[PDB]
Amino acid sequence: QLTAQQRLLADQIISIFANNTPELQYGYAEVLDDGRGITAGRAGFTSATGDMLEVIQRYSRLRPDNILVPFLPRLQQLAASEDGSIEGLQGLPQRWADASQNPVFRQVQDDVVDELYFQPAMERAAELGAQMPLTLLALYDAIIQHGEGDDGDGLPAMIARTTAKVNGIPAEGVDERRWLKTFLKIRKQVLRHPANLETEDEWSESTGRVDSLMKLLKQGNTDLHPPIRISTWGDVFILPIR
Ligand SMILES: N[C@@H]1[C@@H](O)[C@H](O)[C@@H](CO)O[C@H]1O
16 A cells, blocks of 8 residues: 555654654654543554553563563553553553563554554545545544544544545545545544543644644655655654655
8 A cells, every 4th residue: 555665754754743753663652641641652552542451462462471461460550441540550661661671562553553553544545545645644644633433533434534625535436635634623623622621731732643644645645655754743844854
């Protein structure tokens, strides 16, 4: 669905949306007061969302004695009830940072990103008949930030509301740039008025990323050809970095 050089490019873009840098932040770990507990890694795995659990479980299977195995029974509890409780979990950000020095841990992160986020976004893009590279990037960024759940703010609901507005999908003859514009605008409205109020501040400050995607659409760079200019937070970046 995406080129190797398009996927490197999309990862560097999405890293700028999330951490203002094109270098993937495997070692990132913060509490953000968004109702999600601790947020970590390249795709922002979360204590509350069952994200951070799948990574550490898989890692513990590859390496049964790692510095993060003691956090595991607390993590199962949070994932169980989607709990944003920062505590139960002291020291974990530092150990997530340290585990990130291991290429194997970083790889588990890649594997979950592909299993939870990239592949499903690509499957959703193919059911849409979507086939501009920019649309794929926007679906992928969106699935990372909003998730693939059943809420009104998840990617499936936004896709459904985009398809309702333009009476159809690109595989059905609706112009794809029109479907994409609508989706980008519906996304910005969800970020600025999320149904889950705990993520309001964290999401309403993130909408510059939707503008950067919108900017590429209006500039006709729907195929993600280089060079790509991203300046989401004020800092300018010419992708791909080399
Ligand atoms: N709000 C986001 C959720 O959207 C996501 O789980 C994560 C990764 O981007 O980080 C947060 O900031």
